[PDB]
C-alpha cells in the first residue's frame, strides 16, 4: 500500500529525469538511496535538480496548455523550507513580485512542502493568487461570479470586500494543525492591472474594464515521482483570449459583449448581424492593445498556436510522444484559423503533471 506506489513512481521519474539530464549513470545509486529512505521514513526528498526538472516536465506534459514551448525556461522557486504563515505569505508575495517583473512576466512556480501522507502542510484556498471577488445579494451581481463561493468563504473569516467589480481577494491559506485559514490583503504595489482601451475607438474606455496582469494558478497539485505538492502556485503570461473571450465575455463571468457592442456602435439585436462575434473581436483587440501599451507581457492566440506548432516539432525531434487536449488547445476565437484545429492529439496523461484537487471550502 502507499509505499509501493511511491517507489514505483520514483523509479519511473528518476530514470526519465536523469536520462533527460544526461545523468543516467547516477540512477542506480540514487534509486538505492531512495530505496532506504522510503523504507525508513515512508517518503523521499527530491534534490533541487529533480524538483526543478520535475516541475518543468509537469508543464511540458500539461495536455491543455498551448504555451508549452517554453517549458524548459520555467523559473522554479524551492520553498520546501517554509514552516510559518508569515513565511508562506511572504513567499506568495515574492512570487507575485518576481513573476510580474515590472510587466516582463517570468513563468515562475513556487513549490511548498509536499503533503506528508495525505496530510497537507500548506493548503492554499485561492484559485489564483490575484483574482477579483464576486458577490450576489438581492439579485444584484457585483464582481466576478466565479469568485462567489471563495469570496463568501473569505467574508466568513472576517474579510470584507468594498464591493467594486474589481475587489482584489486576499491571499487565503491554512497551515497544518490550524483549524481555520488566515487571510492577508494583497499590497496594491505588488499587483499590476491594465485598463482596457481600444486602439481606434476612443469610447471603449467608457466601459471602465480592467484585468490584472499575471494569472498565478494556485489550486493545482504538482505531482513529481510520487510526491504530491498540493501547494505549488505557478504562472505564465495571459493569452489574450482568456481575458477577452472568456473572463470579460462569458455570460456567467463579466458578460460584457452587449456593452461592447454599444460602445463600438453596432446593434445587438439580430443573430445574423454577428454582433457577438464582432464585439468579441474588438474586445480581444482591445485587450492585446492595452497589455502591450502598458508593457505587460501577453500573447495573441495566433502567435501562441505558432509557438505550440514549434513545441510539437520540438517534441518529435526529441523523440518524445506529444500529448494534448484538442478541446482546450483550440482558442475560443477563430479556432479554425490555427493549425491546432486541423489535427488530432493523444489526450493520454503523462506524469509529472499538474492536477485538479478538491477545494477546501464549499
Ligand atoms: C507562459 C505563458 C502561458 C500561456 C500563454 C499559457 C496558456 C494556457 C492556456 C490558454 C490554457 C487554457 C486555459 C483556459 O483556456 O482557460 C492553459 C492551460 C494550462 N496551462 Fe498553460 N500557459 C502558460 C504557462 C504555463 C505554465 C508556466 C504552467 C505551469 C508551470 C502552465 C500549465 C498549464 C495547465 C496545467 C493548464 C491546464 C489547467 C486546467 O486544466 O484547468 N501553463 N495554458
Ligand atoms: N467546457 C470547456 C471545454 C473546453 C475548454 C474549456 C476551457 C476552460 C476555460 N474556462 C475558464 C477556466 C476555468 C478553469 C481554469 C482555468 O484556467 C486554467 C489555467 C491554468 C494555467 C494557466 C497558465 C497560464 C495561462 N495564461 N493560463 C492558464 C489557465 C480557466 N471549457
Ligand atoms: Cl484567468
Amino acid at each position: 500500500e502507499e509505499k509501493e506506489i511511491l517507489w514505483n513512481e520514483a523509479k519511473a521519474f528518476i530514470a526519465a529525469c536523469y536520462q533527460e539530464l544526461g545523468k543516467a549513470a547516477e540512477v542506480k545509486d540514487r534509486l538505492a538511496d531512495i530505496k532506504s529512505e522510503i523504507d525508513l521514513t515512508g517518503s523521499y526528498v527530491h534534490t533541487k535538480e529533480e524538483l526543478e526538472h520535475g516541475a518543468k516536465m509537469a508543464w511540458r506534459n500539461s495536455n491543455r496548455c498551448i504555451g508549452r514551448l517554453f517549458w524548459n525556461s520555467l523559473n522554479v522557486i524551492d520553498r520546501r523550507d517554509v514552516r510559518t504563515k508569515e513565511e508562506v505569505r511572504d513567499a506568495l508575495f515574492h512570487h507575485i513580485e518576481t513573476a510580474t517583473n515590472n510587466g516582463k512576466i517570468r513563468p515562475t512556480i513556487t513549490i511548498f512542502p509536499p503533503e506528508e501522507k495525505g496530510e497537507k502542510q500548506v493548503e492554499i484556498w485561492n484559485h489564483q493568487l490575484i483574482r477579483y471577488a464576486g458577490y450576489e445579494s438581492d439579485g444584484e451581481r457585483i464582481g466576478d461570479p466565479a469568485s462567489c463561493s471563495l469570496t463568501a468563504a473569505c467574508e466568513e473569516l472576517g474579510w470584507r470586500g468594498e464591493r467594486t467589480d474589481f475587489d482584489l481577494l486576499p491571499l487565503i491559506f491554512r497551515m497544518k494543525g490550524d483549524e481555520q485559514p488566515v487571510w492577508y490583503e494583497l499590497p496594491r504595489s505588488l499587483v499590476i492591472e491594465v485598463p482596457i482601451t481600444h486602439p481606434d475607438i476612443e469610447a471603449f474606455s467608457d466601459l471602465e474594464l480592467k484585468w490584472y496582469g499575471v494569472p498565478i494558478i494556485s489550486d493545482m497539485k504538482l505531482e513529481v515521482g510520487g510526491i504530491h505538492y498540493n501547494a505549488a502556485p505557478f504562472n505564465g503570461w495571459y493569452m489574450g483570449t482568456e481575458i477577452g473571450a472568456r473572463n470579460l465575455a462569458d455570460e456567467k463571468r463579466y458578460d460584457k459583449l452587449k456593452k461592447v457592442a454599444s460602445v463600438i456602435g453596432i446593434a445587438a439585436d439580430y443573430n445574423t448581424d454577428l454582433w457577438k462575434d464582432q464585439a468579441l473581436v474588438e474586445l480581444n483587440k482591445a485587450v492585446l492593445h492595452s497589455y502591450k501599451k502598458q508593457g505587460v507581457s501577453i500573447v495573441d492566440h495566433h502567435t501562441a498556436a505558432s509557438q505550440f506548432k514549434r513545441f510539437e516539432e520540438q517534441a518529435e525531434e526529441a523523440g518524445r510522444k506529444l500529448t494534448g487536449d484538442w478541446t482546450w488547445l483550440i482558442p475560443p476565437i477563430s479556432p479554425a484559423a490555427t493549425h491546432i484545429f486541423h489535427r488530432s492529439y493523444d489526450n493520454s496523461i503523462v506524469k509529472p503533471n499538474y492536477f485538479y484537487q478538491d477545494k477546501p471550502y464549499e
Side-chain angles (χ1 to χ4, degrees):
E1 95 296 341
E2 176 183 356
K3 189 268 183 181
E4 189 67 26
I5 301 97
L6 178 68
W7 171 238
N8 265 11
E9 306 276 351
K11 292 187 287 185
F13 165 68
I14 291 297
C17 176
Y18 280 55
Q19 306 179 213
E20 291 180 22
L21 295 177
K23 294 187 166 187
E26 304 158 49
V27 178
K28 168 100 196 74
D29 283 345
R30 177 61 177 145
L31 283 180
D33 311 343
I34 295 174
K35 181 185 289 293
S36 298
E37 191 167 353
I38 299 170
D39 304 325
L40 312 162
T41 68
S43 180
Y44 74 103
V45 178
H46 289 121
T47 67
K48 288 182 179 292
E49 205 187 29
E50 289 155 3
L51 176 77
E52 174 180 342
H53 201 72
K56 294 176 171 178
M57 288 161 76
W59 180 12
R60 186 180 74 207
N61 287 329
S62 292
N63 289 357
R64 301 173 149 178
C65 176
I66 195 167
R68 291 182 274 162
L69 179 59
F70 307 109
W71 64 274
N72 199 30
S73 61
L74 178 68
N75 169 44
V76 177
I77 299 175
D78 173 15
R79 284 321 316 261
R80 290 173 295 169
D81 52 331
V82 68
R83 296 296 183 264
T84 68
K85 293 185 278 295
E86 290 77 21
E87 287 166 336
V88 171
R89 175 203 63 209
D90 292 353
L92 297 169
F93 284 174
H94 176 70
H95 191 127
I96 293 168
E97 178 176 337
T98 185
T100 297
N101 186 47
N102 292 122
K104 185 176 174 64
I105 288 169
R106 297 193 270 249
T108 305
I109 181 167
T110 297
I111 297 184
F112 289 107
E115 319 169 311
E116 187 70 26
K117 295 297 181 184
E119 202 185 21
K120 297 176 174 42
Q121 310 301 286
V122 191
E123 160 192 290
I124 297 176
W125 285 33
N126 307 76
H127 163 63
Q128 295 171 33
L129 301 184
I130 304 170
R131 226 192 182 195
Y132 299 132
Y135 312 85
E136 170 144 42
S137 68
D138 280 357
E140 70 173 1
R141 299 167 72 141
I142 297 171
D144 192 341
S147 285
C148 288
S149 65
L150 177 59
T151 300
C154 283
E155 291 197 320
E156 282 296 323
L157 309 162
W159 182 80
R160 176 71 175 190
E162 292 173 44
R163 279 158 170 77
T164 79
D165 274 332
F166 303 105
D167 298 342
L168 289 176
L169 282 164
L171 299 183
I172 181 167
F173 58 90
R174 191 184 60 73
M175 306 297 302
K176 179 191 52 182
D178 290 340
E179 181 179 359
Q180 294 296 6
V182 289
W183 59 264
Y184 302 97
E185 274 306 314
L186 284 169
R188 274 252 176 209
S189 65
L190 289 174
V191 172
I192 291 175
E193 292 179 304
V194 178
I196 305 308
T197 58
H198 193 276
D200 297 331
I201 299 168
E202 301 197 337
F204 211 93
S205 46
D206 293 348
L207 298 187
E208 303 193 299
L209 307 178
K210 59 183 186 183
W211 206 253
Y212 49 90
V214 194
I216 312 167
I217 298 285
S218 56
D219 67 346
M220 282 189 90
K221 170 170 305 190
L222 163 69
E223 192 180 332
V224 174
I227 301 312
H228 285 234
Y229 301 97
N230 64 292
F234 60 82
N235 72 278
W237 49 79
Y238 265 117
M239 175 175 87
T241 51
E242 300 174 86
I243 304 160
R246 302 294 316 272
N247 296 343
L248 294 178
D250 276 5
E251 296 195 347
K252 292 183 180 178
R253 305 289 303 289
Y254 280 81
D255 188 21
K256 298 294 184 163
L257 289 192
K258 184 166 163 53
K259 293 182 161 192
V260 169
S262 184
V263 304
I264 69 170
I266 64 178
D269 291 330
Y270 306 91
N271 291 348
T272 46
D273 285 341
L274 302 192
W275 66 262
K276 285 185 188 185
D277 303 80
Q278 188 167 344
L280 269 164
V281 168
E282 293 312 327
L283 177 57
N284 273 283
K285 284 161 67 188
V287 165
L288 297 162
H289 167 74
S290 301
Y291 273 65
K292 298 175 70 67
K293 189 192 262 153
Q294 189 156 325
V296 183
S297 295
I298 193 155
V299 65
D300 66 270
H301 47 290
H302 306 291
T303 305
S306 279
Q307 293 163 342
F308 188 69
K309 185 135 90 162
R310 294 177 50 212
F311 175 70
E312 305 182 17
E313 287 163 1
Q314 161 184 116
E316 177 193 16
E317 292 169 359
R320 276 188 296 264
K321 300 272 186 45
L322 171 69
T323 61
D325 188 342
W326 189 97
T327 69
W328 280 57
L329 289 166
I330 52 162
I333 295 306
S334 310
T338 74
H339 82 278
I340 301 176
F341 182 92
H342 298 281
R343 65 157 283 188
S344 64
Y345 297 95
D346 169 26
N347 195 27
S348 298
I349 285 181
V350 187
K351 296 167 175 194
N353 217 320
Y354 299 99
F355 297 93
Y356 287 165
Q357 58 194 336
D358 291 337
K359 316 174 289 153
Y361 62 91
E362 181 68 22

